[PDB]
Amino acid sequence: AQNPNCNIMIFHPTKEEFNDFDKYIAYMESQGAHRAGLAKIIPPKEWKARETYDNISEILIATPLQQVASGRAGVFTQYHKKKKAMTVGEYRHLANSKKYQTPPHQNFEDLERKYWKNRIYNSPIYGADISGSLFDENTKQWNLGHLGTIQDLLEKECGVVIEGVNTPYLYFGMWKTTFAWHTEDMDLYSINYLHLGEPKTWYVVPPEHGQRLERLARELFPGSSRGCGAFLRHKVALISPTVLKENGIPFNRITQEAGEFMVTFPYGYHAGFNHGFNCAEAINFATPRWIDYGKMASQCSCGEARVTFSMDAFVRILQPERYDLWKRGQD
Ligand SMILES: O=C(O)CNC(=O)C(=O)O
Ligand SMILES: [Mg+2]
Ligand code: NI
Ligand SMILES: [Zn+2]
């Protein structure tokens, strides 16, 4: 079995190998990359996403989110308070202000220590989930707006034609902005490109051990667990590496830098934080290997998780017994 310790693997595809996206995902899996839940892909030196980032300041962040924490430094939840609209140029100036800017630090490890010590005492503002793309239309390789759709994959594998669409999303971050522990909707893959700015640190649990993280989460967030049998779908719970190690949960960590892709694999729980002002683009995708994970994915029916239009068909076709209850949650 390849990669039996479930380490995060880093790939350096050649320009030739960067042509065929599906083929390269399948290659990475042949080497055991999926066992980690997360892989890094460094593009060939010939490749670029677009020519420059000099002209992005006028993009609007319609609903910036202030991420307010509750709990203790290593075990906390966050809620998202809606703020007034602002442009990317306005958000960048805010990120760089004395109140929000990255503190002085020695290296990524020192910054990570500071994050976990002090995150709860601040409320950073995240521009998340903005439909759009920063890839040039002429970028032919690994262009996250030109991927094969999940609807087409389901139709190719299973024969059933379904409604829905699959587009990318932009994320504008600042120091301490946080992504809570989660898997993707319907335990899909994700791909994330860090277009510009400061790094993003990731934590990930191997898919084969995801239920260990769920059992810990039920213990640590006992009211939330009574409220919903899949409350990690709410995307609000944080658990630090120190707490994971104290509880024997297998995990790994890695820092993504500008110009790098990360892929999350089906049922790979992940969480992380941004080091300073940055911009990422991400989208969900599927392969043939996803279908069995989609059929088994948990679902939130309590009403909190509320998701896209396109999840309806995935539940309806892959999980017809759960469909009626899940849809009640959506209405
Ligand atoms: O970058 C972020 O805030 C969150 N991104 C992801 O969870 C992802 O790409 O799957
Ligand atoms: Mg602009
Ligand atoms: Ni994700
Ligand atoms: Zn729920």
Mutation to probe ligand 1, out of 144, 183, 195, 270 (largest number of atoms < 8 A from CB): 270
Residues sharing a CB contact under 8 Å with residue 183, sequence separation 6 or more, in sequence order = 210, 232, 266, 267, 268, 269, 270, 297
Rounded Cα gap, residues 328 and 331, in angstroms? 5
Q: Compute the distance between CA of residue 312 and CA of residue 84 in angstroms, rounded to an integer.
A: 31
Ligand 1 atom at shortest distance from the alpha carbon of 177: 3
Residue 186: count other Cβ atoms within 10 Å of its Cβ. 24
Resolution in A for the shown PDB structure? Answer: 1.3
Task: Say if ligand 1 is within 6 A of residue 179 CB.
Answer: yes
One-letter amino acid for residue 12 of the chain: H
Atom of ligand 1 at shortest range from CA of 184: 10
Output the 3-class SS for 274-315. ECCCEEEEEEEECCCCHHHHHHHCCCCCCCCCCCCCCHHHHH
Kind of pairing between the strands at 237-239 and 75-82: antiparallel
Residue listed under structure tokens 């990360």: 262
264: Cβ below 6 Å to ligand 1?
yes
The answer to the question of whether 279 is labelled as a binding residue is no
Q: Under the phi-then-psi rule, with left for phi > 0, alpha for psi from -120 to 50, and beta for the rest, what region is 278?
A: beta
Note the CATH number of domain 1-331. 2.60.120.650
Structure tokens that stand for 30 in this block: 């042949």
For residue 209, say whether it is annotated as part of any ligand binding site. Answer: no
Extended beta strands in 55-188, E state: 60-61, 65-72, 75-82, 86-87, 125-131, 169-173, 178-182
Neighbours of 309 (CB within 10 A): 10
Out of 175, 187, 190, give the residue to mutate to test ligand 1, the one with the largest number of ligand atoms within 8 Å of its CB. Answer: 190
Which ligand sits closest to the CA of 303? 4
**DSSP conformational letter for 125:** E
Nearest CA owner, ligand 1 atom 10:
190
Question: Which of these, 270, 326, 265, lies nearest to 301 by C-alpha position?
Answer: 326
Report the alpha-carbon distance of residue 191 to residue 40 in Å, rounded: 10
Q: Are 143 and 202 in contact (CB under 8 A)?
A: no
Residues present in the chain in total: 331
All structural domains of the chain with their residue ranges: 1-331
| Torsion, CA 37, CA 256, CA 92, CA 102, rounded to 10 | 110
What experimental approach yielded this model? X-ray
Give the ligand 1 atom nearest the CA of 270.
7
Coil/strand/helix, residue 140: coil
